[PDB]
Design a protein around this ligand. Sequence first.
Ligand SMILES: *[C@@H]1O[C@H](CO)[C@@H](O[C@@H]2O[C@H](CO)[C@@H](O[C@@H]3O[C@H](CO)[C@@H](O)[C@H](O)[C@@H]3O)[C@H](O)[C@H]2NC(C)=O)[C@H](O)[C@H]1NC(C)=O
Ligand SMILES: *[C@@H]1O[C@H](CO[C@@H]2O[C@@H](C)[C@@H](O)[C@@H](O)[C@@H]2O)[C@@H](O)[C@H](O)[C@H]1NC(C)=O
Ligand SMILES: *[C@@H]1O[C@H](CO)[C@@H](O)[C@H](O)[C@H]1NC(C)=O
Ligand SMILES: *[C@@H]1O[C@H](CO)[C@@H](O)[C@H](O)[C@H]1NC(C)=O
Length: 508
Amino acid sequence: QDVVDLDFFTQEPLHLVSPSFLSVTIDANLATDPRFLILLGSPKLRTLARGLSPAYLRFGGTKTDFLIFDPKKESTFEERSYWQSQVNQDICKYGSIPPDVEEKLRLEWPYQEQLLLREHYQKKFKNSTYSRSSVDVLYTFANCSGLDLIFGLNALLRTADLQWNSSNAQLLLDYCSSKGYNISWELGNEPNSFLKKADIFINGSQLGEDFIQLHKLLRKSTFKNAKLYGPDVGQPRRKTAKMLKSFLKAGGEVIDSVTWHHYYLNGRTATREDFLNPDVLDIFISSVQKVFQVVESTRPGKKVWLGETSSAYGGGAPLLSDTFAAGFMWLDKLGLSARMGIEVVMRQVFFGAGNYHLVDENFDPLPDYWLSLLFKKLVGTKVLMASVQGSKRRKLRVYLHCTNTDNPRYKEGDLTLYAINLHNVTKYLRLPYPFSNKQVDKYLLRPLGPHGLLSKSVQLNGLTLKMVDDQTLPPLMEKPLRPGSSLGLPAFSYSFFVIRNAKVAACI
Ligand SMILES: *[C@@H]1O[C@H](CO)[C@@H](O[C@@H]2O[C@H](CO)[C@@H](O[C@@H]3O[C@H](CO)[C@@H](O)[C@H](O)[C@@H]3O)[C@H](O)[C@H]2NC(C)=O)[C@H](O)[C@H]1NC(C)=O
Ligand SMILES: *[C@@H]1O[C@H](CO[C@@H]2O[C@@H](C)[C@@H](O)[C@@H](O)[C@@H]2O)[C@@H](O)[C@H](O)[C@H]1NC(C)=O
Ligand SMILES: *[C@@H]1O[C@H](CO)[C@@H](O)[C@H](O)[C@H]1NC(C)=O
Ligand SMILES: *[C@@H]1O[C@H](CO)[C@@H](O)[C@H](O)[C@H]1NC(C)=O
């Protein structure tokens, strides 16, 4: 019997996630050579980013601590040409990249991506500077896409006696004020590895004092209520958890959320079997619990965010992080993050170097994009609970929220269920009373073509998902089911199910 009874716990929300729960990053290394930020002027990338609104866009990464704002930095032919074409034009409606500039940057980009990835793996970072125009590219991309920019400041600018030197930050904050920019801030990226990356050790008490310093600058700015997030530590291995604890004790008062990072695997060694292994999926739960321990003992009730996360570190697992098979880790991470109290999850990366990107080198969406878009359209902020009967929940993983209220097909009280089947056979889910004779809309994702799970193309209810054109996402078409029918989930797949007229009081 491959028929599994669901239990639903709908009486009240377990947690409330932000409307921006599914958020994204742009790696700070896109600014190593700032010409490549102009790729963010693509109308195709804008269309795709808009599909994920509301969301935060976090500009950060290892390079956050090797970037220096220079208000007099010279621009390049690419940058000068891009900005010259936007003059006297509504950039959000009509902005594009000049075709010569677009062609050149796209020819150079695969070399650049190799450089960025190898620089990362060798841990040989140099300081580089970025201009006012670079800031403007990031700001307008985010603003035109309906995203909220979070900008990571360089925490390795240091005085003689090991204190953060805030003078470059001040330059930047003043520039942003003078343009009317609504930006939230971070300081430093993965401070736990500063010793390896820069042979400077900054401990968490000191980093907290640095955050205190920054908060004081933000209070004196024209944007007095700008938000401040930190400390963007790596996942909570012993020394990292100790550093998080000391940081929160010293600087925990001035941060609006606690940010940490997670990757399941080393991209160099990850296997196909690891991507489908529920034991790999389950280790994320240990990371989450350790984080909440540190936070509850120092700043209880403080919001906890995943500030940078994906399948595999080192730029992603080649031939795996950009596939349908990467969806199991991504959907499960969202499911668990919601159910365990994480308020925002920031996906490394929307676009950029690596293959854990949502959108590729030709600005085409990967399967994880489509998964993210369907999640955004269907899943609401109120987290409920589901479970499967029989204590084999490892391979059939289920999550339940109120249906997204912004969705015009659905109404107050409707439920969105989502489910992952990691068995090698089809499973059938039976809804419990009082949801057992309802109209249900199915949204089943399956990979397209001969590579099966390793495909980079995906179908929704048997229709290939593809952008209509550069300005247009497709409709995501439900498959209505017979009332009372069980919910069928093929081997190695994932699906959403919207329970219509469910009338759940908690979702109203
Ligand atoms: C976290 O990092 C800070 C460094 O920013 C450490 O603070 C420093 O700690 C040492 C104590 O071992 C201080 O050295 C002492 O200085 C006094 C003079 O002020 C001198 O009388 C002592 O003989 C000794 O040399 C140093 O001043 C201090 N710096 C600051 C700015 O406070 C801190 O100890 C570290 N904490 C942990 C738990 O690792
Ligand atoms: C499939 O997985 C097996 C273990 O899973 C169990 O058996 C399968 C057929 C389903 O009934 C599932 O619900 C069970 O949890 C492995 O031992 C077996 O080697 C695998 N079979 C194939 C054909 O790959
Ligand atoms: C980067 O520049 C800052 C100040 O401009 C300096 O303190 C730091 O040591 C430099 N680091 C590297 C790795 O070049
Ligand atoms: C901070 O950095 C600025 C700009 O590089 C430098 O001129 C200044 O001396 C530094 N301040 C301290 C307190 O070290």
